[PDB]
Design a protein around this ligand. Sequence first.
Ligand SMILES: N[C@@H](CCS)C(=O)O
Ligand SMILES: [Fe+3]
Length: 186
Amino acid sequence: ELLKPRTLADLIRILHELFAGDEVNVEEVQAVLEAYESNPAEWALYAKFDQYRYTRNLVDQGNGKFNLMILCWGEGHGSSIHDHTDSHCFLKLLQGNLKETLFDWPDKKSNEMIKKSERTLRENQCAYINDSIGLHRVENVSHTEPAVSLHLFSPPFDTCHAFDQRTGHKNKVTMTFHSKFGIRTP
Ligand SMILES: N[C@@H](CCS)C(=O)O
Ligand SMILES: [Fe+3]
């Protein structure tokens, strides 16, 4: 029985319930993530920016089955084209806008990766992806507004691949946390 999260803290408790079992109900998780109305005061602690690239800020370690983090995107900051390591990825906008560009898994042959589609995620919207769906790139294309997003991954993962848009070639990346629980972690 899914209720509206009243606050970020509330959202986290609900996520522990949802992941209390071995199976994820994706539409339910996406629904509750969406239902949370972004309140900048609730997550300001986690919203730590870097001048040159986007940052990953851990919010909750989950119950072994997931974790939850906040990503902060300066003007013009974006990601690589990437996968999600056989895990669920949920992404919700907390501030600003992000452009999400979808790509298919590349064939063996070296080829331009052509955009399958793109969309603009606006404040409070929650997107979902997993490897069965495809790959994506996420970008703050604004010249004037920073962006902030909330990401839920299940199971947790700290590695993934980046794909070269010219060739489809992948490289394994290890991701780092800019902060954990509000604390900068160099
Ligand atoms: N999964 C990547 C990009 C956002 S979905 C990350 O953790 O930085
Ligand atoms: Fe992603």
